[PDB]
Amino acid sequence: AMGNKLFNIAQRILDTNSVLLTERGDYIVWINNSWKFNSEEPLITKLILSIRHQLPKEYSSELLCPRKRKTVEANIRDMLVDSVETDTYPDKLPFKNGVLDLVDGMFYSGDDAKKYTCTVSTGFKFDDTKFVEDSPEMEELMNIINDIQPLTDENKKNRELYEKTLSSCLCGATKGCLTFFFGETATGKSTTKRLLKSAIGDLFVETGQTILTDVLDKGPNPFIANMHLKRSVFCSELPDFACSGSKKIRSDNIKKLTEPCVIGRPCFSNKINNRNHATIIIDTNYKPVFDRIDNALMRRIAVVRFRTHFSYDKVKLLDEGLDGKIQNNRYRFAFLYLLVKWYKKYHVPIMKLYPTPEEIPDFAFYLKIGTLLVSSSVKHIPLMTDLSKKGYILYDNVVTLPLTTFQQKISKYFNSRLFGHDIESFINRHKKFANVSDEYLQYIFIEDI
Amino acid sequence: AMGNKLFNIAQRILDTNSVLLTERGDYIVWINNSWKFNSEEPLITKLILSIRHQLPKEYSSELLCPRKRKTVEANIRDMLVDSVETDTYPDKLPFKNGVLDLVDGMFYSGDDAKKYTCTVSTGFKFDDTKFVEDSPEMEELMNIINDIQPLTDENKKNRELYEKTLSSCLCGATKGCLTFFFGETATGKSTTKRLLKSAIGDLFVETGQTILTDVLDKGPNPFIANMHLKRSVFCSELPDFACSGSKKIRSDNIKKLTEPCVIGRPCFSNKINNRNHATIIIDTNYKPVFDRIDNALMRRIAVVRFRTHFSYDKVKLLDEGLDGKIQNNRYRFAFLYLLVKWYKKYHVPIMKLYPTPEEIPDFAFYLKIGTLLVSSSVKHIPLMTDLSKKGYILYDNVVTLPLTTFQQKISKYFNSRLFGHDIESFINRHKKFANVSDEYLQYIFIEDI
Amino acid sequence: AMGNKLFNIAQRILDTNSVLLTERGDYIVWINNSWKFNSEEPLITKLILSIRHQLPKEYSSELLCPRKRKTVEANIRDMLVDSVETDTYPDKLPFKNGVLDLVDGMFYSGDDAKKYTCTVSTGFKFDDTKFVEDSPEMEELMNIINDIQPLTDENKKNRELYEKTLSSCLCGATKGCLTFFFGETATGKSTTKRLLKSAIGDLFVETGQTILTDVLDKGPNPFIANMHLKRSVFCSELPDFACSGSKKIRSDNIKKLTEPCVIGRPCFSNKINNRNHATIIIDTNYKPVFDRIDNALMRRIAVVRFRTHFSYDKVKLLDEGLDGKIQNNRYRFAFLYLLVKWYKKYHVPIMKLYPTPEEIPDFAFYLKIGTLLVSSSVKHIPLMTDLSKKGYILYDNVVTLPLTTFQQKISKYFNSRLFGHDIESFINRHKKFANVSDEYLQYIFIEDI
Amino acid sequence: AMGNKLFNIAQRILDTNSVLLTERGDYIVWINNSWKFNSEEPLITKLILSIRHQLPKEYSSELLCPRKRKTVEANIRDMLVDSVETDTYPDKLPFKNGVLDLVDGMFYSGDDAKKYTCTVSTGFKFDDTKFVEDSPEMEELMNIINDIQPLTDENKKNRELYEKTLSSCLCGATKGCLTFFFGETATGKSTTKRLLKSAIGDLFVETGQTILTDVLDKGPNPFIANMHLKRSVFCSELPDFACSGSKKIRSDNIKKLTEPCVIGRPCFSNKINNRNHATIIIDTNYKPVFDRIDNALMRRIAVVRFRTHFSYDKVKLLDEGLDGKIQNNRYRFAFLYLLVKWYKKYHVPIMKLYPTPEEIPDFAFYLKIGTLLVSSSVKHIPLMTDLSKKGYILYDNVVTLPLTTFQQKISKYFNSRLFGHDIESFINRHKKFANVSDEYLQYIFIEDI
């Protein structure tokens, strides 16, 4: 003994596509020009109460009743079967008033933004009037950024990489190459972090050294749970790697947070499948030291140096009143305009994240090795005719070089006194013993091919 | 004071067999040509709302009411008594549009797929138009795979085993022999993993070294919980086994993940009985080192080597743009067609997984021992007439060989300098002491029978 | 089959804005001139029962029914969509009778206080009659405070900083500089803590050494959960830092509790985003010793010394009966008046928290270093023409000073015998090796520019 | 479609103030002359069913219905807004028949006790007939107590302190000074504990060494949760402090359980704010040894010695049948009368708890130090004219005494052989080094002022 019109109301509600079912089995609603979502309290009832006005008068009176409204909510829940995924596009930026595009830079609102289904938003209302380049705040922030990173040819590559990383912080896609902020304390890294956080609102997230030094997938992991559906990750607090007791940046962790779907359990929920749209920028004051080094990690890591102090490459005075404007979001829209311009300059139309392993001594050593230490293969076997008199003894049909000769030759190209531990670790990892003592390495110099 | 027609509606719904009760006490529904299932929210109400159209007009109006719909759902729950198990067949591949067969290669959809009850699906809609061999993507992917594994007689066995393992990744049956991917970094293992994951969608799963180096059944285990009802398991991140601190591949774990029903507790649920349909491929860069070695493990382990680098057996240049096509699923259906062809070539009509222990030095040593070190028995007792003058002293009615003689003879067939630790461990594990010092081993050479 | 007038009642209730939805997804109500809030039991029903009197007679009779009242509560929950944040203003002090302003010192009540949405309150009813300067309690408490901190020129800076910190305890904004209470046992720190707690009621909170010596974000953290939305944090029980086993004040923790939004998980709830409005005063009896020292921490730390004992700078007799008046809140409103006067004197109109690192020997050493040890840069490279004969050898295009020369010169300005460990730690942290032994530091004296 | 009279019934119920809302958000009821309270099951329905008799006949018939009774309960819950706190008075003792006053010694019952809102009760019905001094049980118990503590001038102070502590066990206020029971095994401490427990019923609580030797605020803490709203805490089982492995009585814990509101988390509930009305008596057999010693702790600790054994100051025979009478509560009301008389003698009208640190050798040493070792100050600087020739060298404008002179002088007043460890710890804690070796202490003898 119930009503029949309520199913028609539910069908009309589903016609507008104002409520969608996520791939995680959660229901989202489109209210106040924003895809609001809440797993704890279902927002379907609020959606119905909101959109009662967009329906004929014969239905709003029916929807005024909470019993009938819950009935319509149940009907909508039954009708939503296809678990349509959301947040597909990486080139759209959601706001509290709509969605701002990164391709053309135009801001959408209302039903134009409704075409996009964003799980989150920037956390503040968009303002085109404040989103203009012709403003004193824009010039002030441009000068501040140029102080942080000079527009000099010596810093040209570093400045360009810094701009590319800050622009990629906008993109809602998987990060292809981790980025590091190298320098000293208060060299511009913290100011950049604060400006980016103020610009992107709730999309920003900050964390410590846990994800870089500890195991991620072990029971609950609130850090990874919060990092999901984010736009940028800032990892500060890195320890003195030379000093004892400081954990290394685990390459397993780096390979873990470089995938579209990163595992990790949230708190009292099943959300292990996490979408990773965040540009992870690591704030540190020392040169990074890792546990495992290989070509994949060297292609996964970019380094942005900071060489300008504010009491290096340039020394200026401290601006104590700068932080107050950042906390008041004075340079929020100016920084957003700068980020949009950088995205248009670099990442439009294709996202690009190229590594800079040459900025790390360990990765530079490994690259200079891999260039001159190509691994032996079947194609290298016919080189024995010339390598027999060059010290290469053929062991197990592999061109093998004696350890003593390998060390005497690697001391010629690398500073053995500076690279002592690195050479020792490379030898201990990549050497093979003939019987007990005739230790050899299966790598051939270019000068011997 | 309720209705009587609702029970008739429930009986009609159960006539179509659109809702089934699993062996785990969970209810599945058949909506949108897919066996959708959800333990959190019962999908029976959605099933009724969907199939109201497949019923006379006198019943759809009744079903429009959520109260009566919940009543029908309760009736269906009461009527479902026989806990019919699902996912029986290993030769069927489920899709978002139906089920693709591996016997004939024909794709079923609609009620044809409804005959099959698949707990999961590949996670994407099937497309026969893209599932064709006559396509440029197929040729490109064939060339890429041939680069990863050449079609050479020297690599013929390795390539054939690699194809067999990738085809067995499709089969929804228990794995009979674990498979290893041996090589260096970025030798083709990661590309194969990405291609297989893109091809099989949600059926793919990836994990670390925990299941291979740690204890599985200890409280909650989300890894095993996710691995259930899967088609393939990829285990990357294996440590340098020669270096200290790196755990060994526990043979107990290997024997644990080689059964149709593998124990392991999920998170806040009772699903310890897990169906294992996954082909576990282990990505590593070193030769594996285990904790326990025996004939069962040697028959449980297959090794697929990778001998082609992309800057070995062949060295080529790097294709940086290859990963973008994989992430865009350009070679998804081409890889699926290749997998289907391999399954037809090898696993049709009978699944076969034969071990290759000869690719591991430890297993090769153990096999060469077991051939020449047959254990003494009652049948070997009458050999004493000839073995008394051959050094075999009869102890406890067992043909016993002195430890010194055993070592002096095992040094003849095995390189003692290379196999020092292996011989020492075998002696310490399989020797017996006569009184305190006349240590003997209960094994006889073939040259002495 | 329900009523239509109930939605009109809900609309009238929402017209008064007596119920708001927080950013945390929680509902607050305005009853008895106070923004009462409870996550466990929804107070909306109580709000409706209270404000039935502020509605026409045709609606109070409807609201007398708990069924209709729950219906109206559901309607209000549906109508509350915009998650309006609360506790914006830092210059307003909430009471059980209203809100007391810090700008003009006038107390608001009723609808005047309703304009302000305070999550918490001082926990006691305001009394303007007791909030007067012309009272014997005010003079007694002024004399007591002057005994605790004399109004002498030698103590002028310390007394002024103490007053500024106690006034900032009122402000509901983020703390910009941590404050320390240094002295001996019962030198006035405990009396100040008790007086401040009695003055500010529930806004006060006290904790131990856990947040200063341990990791905050690790699972549940009831300390941080209680510290949220607070006005002041008192950290007593600091250990003897010279003695072994005593943990150092972690600079990571200090940087953690200096942000408007501090992470940390509560008990069985999702409230990791915590608003930090608390002035953290650390009660200690020793000079602090930290794990990491830098300019940011030196700008984050202020020190208030206590130099007057009550049996230093002054010694008096003990007042045993003082604590009884504090526990009876005799000097509650007098201390509140003093705090308001201090806030008007210092923090009106702008909150200011300036560090005093010169009160810590470690920070004084670091400041005297950083003044005379400016780091080398590109601008310092052209100084080589004069620094070549001054001992500065150019290494890697950096002005480098030998370690022996650096030590022989740092012994001239700092007492090496007193600063032995500090100099050793600074050398071990900031030195670089040329090859193996020619250790250098990249810092230049002012006398050499 | 409900009734209107039910709200009138709820208003009449709230008129009697038979149900109150606690500060913890819990509801209490007044049934059977007792403020019964239960967080698990709301007792409001039972209260309504009980007080239906105190209402006109037109309302009891309405209240007979459980549906209408639950409706009235909901109305009462809505009407209870002001979270009135309970258990204010420290001078009232609750019983199962009412409340017994400590000021005049008169027992209240019915509505007279209803004026008082006690969270707990003594757990047994009061009996004025058994609450008389003229009874053989009173004389027997007086003789037993005099055996436990003689009425001798040598024991006069100890007996008086023991009586004061036992009387303060009645007071429902915060303890101002911790009390210790010192002696040997079965010297009267256990008998006193049993008698007090039998006298005060459920108000008594007993615990081990955890709260005195471990950290309180670490997750759940059922000990502190049970100790809340109690009248006395007995801590037995103290270990041999001289032996290794025995934890010290943490002064941090002592300062923690000496506040009206003591933190500590209960089990699966939010009751961290705990009211501490309990007199904590510590049962031990050794002299206490602490981790931190200062004037605050010396003023926080009282010691009651036991010097009469029952096979010291007196030795008698064992009364084996004494415990049976205690377990049968024969001396319950006699002990209650004795406690009331002691409260009238000492704590009426003002609660007093004065420390006795002279009973502990460590505290006696510290007091004798602090008398003769007044810390140097600015007022002590002008004493340099006479202290320059007395060995006091002026360092950093502080009167400093050499360590060798300090030791040679402290050996004159204290037995250095007995106080070796104490003097060593005091030196290691309170000394300062001039440069590396000229160690000094900033304390001046009285003989030098």
mmCIF file of C-alpha atoms in Angstrom, chain B residues 171-249:
data_model
loop_
_atom_site.group_PDB
_atom_site.id
_atom_site.type_symbol
_atom_site.label_atom_id
_atom_site.label_comp_id
_atom_site.label_asym_id
_atom_site.label_seq_id
_atom_site.Cartn_x
_atom_site.Cartn_y
_atom_site.Cartn_z
ATOM 1 C CA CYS B 171 43.002 -20.791 -17.343
ATOM 2 C CA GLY B 172 40.779 -20.595 -14.272
ATOM 3 C CA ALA B 173 42.228 -23.692 -12.602
ATOM 4 C CA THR B 174 44.757 -24.454 -9.883
ATOM 5 C CA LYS B 175 48.379 -23.866 -10.844
ATOM 6 C CA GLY B 176 50.346 -27.101 -10.928
ATOM 7 C CA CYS B 177 53.821 -25.584 -11.205
ATOM 8 C CA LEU B 178 55.072 -22.168 -10.089
ATOM 9 C CA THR B 179 56.797 -20.056 -12.744
ATOM 10 C CA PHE B 180 59.714 -17.633 -12.379
ATOM 11 C CA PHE B 181 60.812 -14.779 -14.642
ATOM 12 C CA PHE B 182 64.613 -14.677 -14.480
ATOM 13 C CA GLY B 183 66.793 -11.972 -15.994
ATOM 14 C CA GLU B 184 68.029 -8.434 -15.395
ATOM 15 C CA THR B 185 66.172 -5.158 -14.877
ATOM 16 C CA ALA B 186 63.890 -4.147 -17.775
ATOM 17 C CA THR B 187 64.747 -7.224 -19.847
ATOM 18 C CA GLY B 188 61.108 -7.749 -20.858
ATOM 19 C CA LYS B 189 59.565 -8.926 -17.597
ATOM 20 C CA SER B 190 57.931 -5.590 -16.754
ATOM 21 C CA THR B 191 56.665 -5.168 -20.326
ATOM 22 C CA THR B 192 55.134 -8.653 -20.203
ATOM 23 C CA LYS B 193 53.538 -7.859 -16.835
ATOM 24 C CA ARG B 194 52.027 -4.618 -18.146
ATOM 25 C CA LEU B 195 50.761 -6.243 -21.355
ATOM 26 C CA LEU B 196 49.192 -9.157 -19.470
ATOM 27 C CA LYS B 197 47.573 -6.808 -16.950
ATOM 28 C CA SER B 198 46.135 -4.638 -19.726
ATOM 29 C CA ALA B 199 44.893 -7.750 -21.538
ATOM 30 C CA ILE B 200 43.159 -9.454 -18.598
ATOM 31 C CA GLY B 201 41.917 -6.359 -16.766
ATOM 32 C CA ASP B 202 40.736 -6.889 -13.200
ATOM 33 C CA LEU B 203 41.679 -10.586 -13.325
ATOM 34 C CA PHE B 204 45.307 -9.475 -12.996
ATOM 35 C CA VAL B 205 46.862 -8.903 -9.580
ATOM 36 C CA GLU B 206 50.330 -7.814 -8.472
ATOM 37 C CA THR B 207 52.112 -8.232 -5.150
ATOM 38 C CA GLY B 208 55.530 -7.969 -3.542
ATOM 39 C CA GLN B 209 57.835 -10.341 -1.689
ATOM 40 C CA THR B 210 55.573 -10.814 1.351
ATOM 41 C CA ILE B 211 53.797 -13.985 0.195
ATOM 42 C CA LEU B 212 57.114 -15.509 -0.916
ATOM 43 C CA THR B 213 59.182 -14.543 2.145
ATOM 44 C CA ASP B 214 56.703 -14.309 5.055
ATOM 45 C CA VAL B 215 54.058 -16.429 6.781
ATOM 46 C CA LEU B 216 50.673 -16.307 5.049
ATOM 47 C CA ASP B 217 48.188 -17.580 7.657
ATOM 48 C CA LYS B 218 48.660 -15.143 10.542
ATOM 49 C CA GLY B 219 45.519 -13.158 11.308
ATOM 50 C CA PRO B 220 44.280 -10.907 8.512
ATOM 51 C CA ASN B 221 45.980 -11.277 5.132
ATOM 52 C CA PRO B 222 44.665 -8.817 2.519
ATOM 53 C CA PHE B 223 47.147 -10.106 -0.084
ATOM 54 C CA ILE B 224 45.689 -13.625 -0.098
ATOM 55 C CA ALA B 225 42.179 -12.162 0.160
ATOM 56 C CA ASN B 226 42.749 -10.161 -3.034
ATOM 57 C CA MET B 227 44.522 -13.078 -4.749
ATOM 58 C CA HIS B 228 41.380 -15.221 -4.468
ATOM 59 C CA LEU B 229 39.328 -15.761 -7.641
ATOM 60 C CA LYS B 230 42.177 -14.271 -9.697
ATOM 61 C CA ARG B 231 43.694 -15.390 -12.992
ATOM 62 C CA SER B 232 47.361 -14.451 -12.481
ATOM 63 C CA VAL B 233 49.670 -13.303 -9.672
ATOM 64 C CA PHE B 234 52.796 -11.247 -10.399
ATOM 65 C CA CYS B 235 55.414 -11.142 -7.625
ATOM 66 C CA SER B 236 58.061 -8.495 -8.276
ATOM 67 C CA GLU B 237 60.684 -6.953 -5.965
ATOM 68 C CA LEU B 238 62.867 -9.858 -5.176
ATOM 69 C CA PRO B 239 65.929 -9.011 -3.066
ATOM 70 C CA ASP B 240 69.569 -9.868 -3.668
ATOM 71 C CA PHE B 241 69.660 -13.375 -2.203
ATOM 72 C CA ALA B 242 73.465 -13.436 -1.979
ATOM 73 C CA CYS B 243 73.434 -10.340 0.240
ATOM 74 C CA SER B 244 72.672 -10.769 3.929
ATOM 75 C CA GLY B 245 69.274 -9.879 5.352
ATOM 76 C CA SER B 246 67.322 -11.015 2.279
ATOM 77 C CA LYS B 247 64.741 -13.670 3.102
ATOM 78 C CA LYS B 248 64.620 -16.921 1.152
ATOM 79 C CA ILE B 249 61.680 -18.043 -0.967
#
